[PDB]
């Protein structure tokens, strides 16, 4: 369950303060596919990145 109010509407830098589990719950894969180009400019950790990469493989 994405916490109330916390669902990602853009792939932007305020996602850096999402926990691994919150990324998984709050970031729809479609969204992420279309704003893929943003990710490599956001200072994500290797752990956060693992989760985002898992999302895109769901697809």
């Amino acid at each position, epitope marked *: 369950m994405c916490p109330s109010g916390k669902k990602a509407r853009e792939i932007d830098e305020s996602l*850096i*303060f999402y926990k691994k589990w919150e990324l998984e719950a709050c970031v729809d894969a479609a969204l992420l596919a279309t704003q893929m180009d943003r990710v490599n400019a956001i*200072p994500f950790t*290797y752990e956060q990145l693992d989760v985002l990469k898992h999302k895109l493989d769901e697809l």
Partner: antibody
Amino acid sequence: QVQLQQSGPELEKPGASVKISCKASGYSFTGYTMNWVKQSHGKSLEWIGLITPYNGASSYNQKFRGKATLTVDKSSSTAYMDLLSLTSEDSAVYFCARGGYDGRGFDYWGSGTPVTVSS
Amino acid sequence: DIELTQSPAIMSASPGEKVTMTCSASSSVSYMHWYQQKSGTSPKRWIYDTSKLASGVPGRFSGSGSGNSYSLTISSVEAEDDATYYCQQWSKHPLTFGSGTKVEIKR
């Protein structure tokens, strides 16, 4: 043991810039974000911004955009912060602090670099 | 930006007492972390993810809170707890800190 060794006290004239540094040992530098914090003598803490050393991506507190520039040198596991066009309101102690795994706050902090801006 | 209001600003505590300090956030926070700083030292991560003991922290420290009101509790105060404790929200960019609750020890 994880260690963040910051550079010594600086003294700079209003309008000059200064580059302070933070050398990390005891872990995998690219495994963790590195953060910078400012504390004004006798005051609270403000987050300046952070950076992931692997690719150099970074993110800043708007208030510090322009004032500060974060960079790293992976091959010496050193992180740097450039402070530009200094005024007396930049006189403060600046810390680096490693972000704990998966967002668990700042789990290791450096000793602090005191910077004094005066004529 | 999320505004953190810590209270009391100065807490004075007799050793053995149980005491709680609060951090109100101006809006909703997912996790709060707390740091202890003693005059002239780097801050030290004390409680993280709202309620978990950071490494090496004595068991008498705890944390709780939901949504807007977070608290840090010392279940039995001791001479060495004299310090300033800062909360920090880890929820909305940019990260913000309270201005600290300072704990002074009664003797």
